Amino acid sequence: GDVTVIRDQYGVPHLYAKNKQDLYKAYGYVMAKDRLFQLEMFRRGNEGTVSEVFGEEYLAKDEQSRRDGYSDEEIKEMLNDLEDKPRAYIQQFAEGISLYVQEALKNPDEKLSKEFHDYKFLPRKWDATDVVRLYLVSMTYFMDNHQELTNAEILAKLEQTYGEEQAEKMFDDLVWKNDPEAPASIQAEDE
């Protein structure tokens, strides 16, 4: 399996492969080659191991990440339930990252970015679960929220101040059940 990589004037890699299995491996490799230290810290974020390199300031962050996260075995079950081709591509993606790691470890002072030298730690091998963790660490941020608790505190204090009747009216104005005048991306009448 062989893949051609073309870098343009901005350094963007354009991969030309003979199949998707090789394509996705080169995918992970060029991304690792360009952003290894960034990938490592994103994985450490999800795994809650940032404090291993950056110290006790990240302890609470690590604890929160593990609190709400999945075990290595739970992610394996998620992978097993995928279709054959996508699972294999995620695996090839991980092996491509792992490939540049091997390459970088054999020549650290040329192929490891200054951050590794400054903070005195190394990159590590990657498996398919680690690739899922790169997705969990960021995509969850746009879905997760505890605003139900903040609203309960708002309503509780408003009730203590204004009584139940007025507090509910104020709450209805702050956090409405619906605003029918809110601009919407689509309209049923437009079909």
Partner: protein, 536 residues
Amino acid sequence: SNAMIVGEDKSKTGNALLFSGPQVGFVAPGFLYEVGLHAPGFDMEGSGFIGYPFIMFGANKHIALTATAGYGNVTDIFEEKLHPNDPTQYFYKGEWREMEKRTETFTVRGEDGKPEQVETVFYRTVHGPVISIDEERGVAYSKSWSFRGTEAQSMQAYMKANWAKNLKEFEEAASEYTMSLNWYYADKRGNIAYYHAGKQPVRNEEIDERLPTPGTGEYDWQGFQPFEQNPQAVNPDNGYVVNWNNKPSQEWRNGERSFYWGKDNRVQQFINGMEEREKVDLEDLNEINYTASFAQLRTHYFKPLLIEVLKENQSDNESYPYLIKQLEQWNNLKEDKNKDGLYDAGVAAFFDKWWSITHDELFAQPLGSVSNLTQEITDHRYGATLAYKILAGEETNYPWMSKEEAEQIIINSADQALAELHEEKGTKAENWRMPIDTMTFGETSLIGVQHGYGSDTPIIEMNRGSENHYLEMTPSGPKGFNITPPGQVGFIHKDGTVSEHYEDQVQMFANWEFKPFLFDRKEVREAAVSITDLNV
């Protein structure tokens, strides 16, 4: 994050258009990773979030796609009733239950480099991870995600969207994406399509979805809605779909974050641009993006109200005629066209102050007891719907104040803004021009974990995507232009000098310059700097 899709009827060239603008911060190395993927039966160019094995903002041979966070109601908090003598037991379906416990050991690098160890225990209930245990109040709060355990399924769905070639295949992938994202589609036939994806729980009818759900079992999720009920449209007869994290459709709800979706919503900047142009090209979309990036968002609803109130009390204050005319001539932007480091319209400084004073006069007293929590609601990033309704005399649930009291706040706030400007800057709008706010590509992203060294190069602040694609699906394939700041490569040499492609797109970003979208091999070869082989 913002997005636009334009059908052939709305497109000057007759080809469907797509615009991407994910807002994931400005960091170095960047949050995005641009790539070209080409194998037999699959050609795709664009960018996705770092670490993702798929393109989210780009186009393949047949379709272009992008996404914005849906902000659908996919997270619920359950209030568990605790055992009076054991905070690790909760009552559920008629029986006391034990929380699932597990121990985790954290290794912490000491100030002296020696590794210390801390051990902690975390808890889950039937509803999800426990995020808080309140022993005094006898309750704990657990966190249920409608997508719990299906994140890998979502990844697979995004991969199928990369491989999709017609819309039937794109819709199927969208039906499989379990997390809350808006998905946008455009193909070479001229079609556009929109899907507000994400698993929607079927909730108990008695529950107020703005507040935590009791966890004793009577109010559990009863299933999930079929994807057919998620908001979605193909080829709306207005010929476009725009989104800036706003409401998907008039029938849709999202519970505790409803205050994101009000009458006053920032997507108005994109709607205006589309409604004021009969047909659009990629250059029009860039004009709209520019407007949205520099718009003072409160102008849309509040400036006309301010102007009217000033005219009605014009004879009461001698500065109002000049003030009225400066507001009317102002294009509502905070921009720096001549690049002198000053916002071009000085009256924008008056309007910033007027809004700030007005908002505080509306809510500082009535909400003083909760202002730390309600300020993000009443002065929200997307709009100030309640404030507008009060000031405009529109119906509210609570009688905050009369129309007359609101008029007086508008006048008082205007006089105070003028007074402060007269005391501090001068009598002419040009004296009021404020220095531009600037930003740098920092070292820590939304994931809250330092991932690099960032950058020191400042650029003008912009309410804008971390990258932009402008795509036109011509019959011969996708074409256009994009920008992916700060640069492709995050490598820093041991010498301390950054890669040549670490930051070489920052000024293009700041100066509204773009590089060509590269897709077919002829144009990729012409752009080639280096060619290289690879293995398995």
